[PDB]
Amino acid sequence: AALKNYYEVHKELFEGVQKWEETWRLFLEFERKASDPNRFNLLKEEKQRAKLQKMLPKLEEELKARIELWEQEHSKAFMVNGQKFMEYVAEQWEMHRLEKERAKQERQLKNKKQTETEMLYGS
Hints:
This is Protein regulator of cytokinesis 1. Residues 41-120 form a coiled coil. Residues 4-123 are annotated as: Spectrin-fold. The record marks 39, 44 as: Tubulin binding. With 123 residues, this protein is mainly alpha-helical. The chain has one domain (1-123): Methane Monooxygenase Hydroxylase, Chain G, domain 1 (Up-down Bundle), CATH 1.20.58. It is built from 4 helices and 2 strands. It has helices at 2-7, 9-35, 42-74, 85-121; strands at residues 79-80, 83-84. It has a two-stranded antiparallel ribbon with strand order 1-2. 2% of the residues are buried.
């Protein structure tokens, strides 16, 4: 049965792909709660977010290891719906960062003007 198991190595990468996607989605969910302005389950949410923070690097290093080996064996790039998986992962991390910054910038701008409005117009 060993030839079949060899051709399913491509499928093994995909279970890790799915687990990365699930864990990343969870991370986002505890990052939204962490950053939003009406957050003020605190220890739960922080503890749960911290666990996800720890796990993502470890999933990612494992997946890169398994992909590089696979690519070397098969002389092919490991592609996920049109993209090399670890590049897609990098891009998710940057989109998130930019989105967190864009959100911090908009709230700061909203804070600034609201202070200005209260100085002039507050009762």
